[PDB]
Amino acid sequence: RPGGDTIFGKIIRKEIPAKIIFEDDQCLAFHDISPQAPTHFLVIPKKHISQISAAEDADESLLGHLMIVGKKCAADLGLKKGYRMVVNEGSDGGQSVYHVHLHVLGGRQMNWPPG
Amino acid sequence: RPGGDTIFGKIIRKEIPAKIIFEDDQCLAFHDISPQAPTHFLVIPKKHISQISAAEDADESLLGHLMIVGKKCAADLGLKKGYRMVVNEGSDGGQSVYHVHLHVLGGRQMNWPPG
Numbered sequence A, B: 001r002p003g004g005d006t007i008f009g010k011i012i013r014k015e016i017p018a019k020i021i022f023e024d025d026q027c028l029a030f031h032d033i034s035p036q037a038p039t040h041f042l043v044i045p046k047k048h049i050s051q052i053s054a055a056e057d058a059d060e061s062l063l064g065h066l067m068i069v070g071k072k073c074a075a076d077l078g079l080k081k082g083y084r085m086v087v088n089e090g091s092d093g094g095q096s097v098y099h100v101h102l103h104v105l106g107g108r109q110m111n112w113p114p115g
């Protein structure tokens, strides 16, 4: 559209508000509307990739970029005792938004199994 | 050493056995010794990076490569109803091995919060 037709596309295009933490030419990081920990944000690419199973070999750097941006935002938000990054794929993974996104949660002890 | 001084380095060097699923010039994927789901494997880089907070901007492609390899292995292992990818960082994240690794779990419904 550009950005995609999900709500994430609307956020990228600034059509609906979000608490934006950081943004560059490739991605955007913003807080989750339903935090599962004291700090819970998402890092999403500006390029619409619907699922991680649909990402191409060429999307490799982009995907790695979401993680580098995720670690920089986490440190800047003070998650110095650690955090957990999560990517959900499909029904079994619990994915609800069909635009690839990385979850970053911290501020409390994360338990195991990870769901 | 090369591979690092953790058990992951020993696995990479074939000094101790693991159920290896796939291997290329950059990484290795093998089954977790303590599965938290029917299918639970790890994708680790051959380059030792101790923590995701320690990864450099140059490790971006490598990190994205762990995810691409993770999705290809998941599909090859039949996780067609989906899966969840997880990266744990530090104490709060629950990290126990100081060699960056990506968890891929599937074969059952993954719940929320992710720990």
Ligand SMILES: Nc1nc2c(ncn2[C@@H]2O[C@H](COP(=O)(O)O)[C@@H](O)[C@H]2O)c(=O)[nH]1
Pocket (backbone or CB within 6 Å): A007, A018, A019, A030, A031, A032, A033, A034, A042, A088, A094, A095, A096, A097, A101
């Ligand atoms: N900031 C923000 N987060 C949203 C919105 N709609 C959905 N989310 C969050 O997006 C996440 C998508 O993750 P999923 O469930 O696909 O793994 C959920 O945690 C959900 O709370 C929204 O309008 N704004």
Ligand SMILES: Nc1nc2c(ncn2[C@@H]2O[C@H](COP(=O)(O)O)[C@@H](O)[C@H]2O)c(=O)[nH]1
Pocket (backbone or CB within 6 Å): B007, B018, B019, B030, B031, B032, B033, B034, B042, B088, B094, B095, B096, B097, B101
């Ligand atoms: N295949 C294999 N998995 C291991 C071994 N030692 C530790 N692990 C697994 O490595 C994972 C490390 O994840 P962490 O707890 O750091 O997030 C754990 O799930 C643990 O069960 C081993 O000797 N072989």
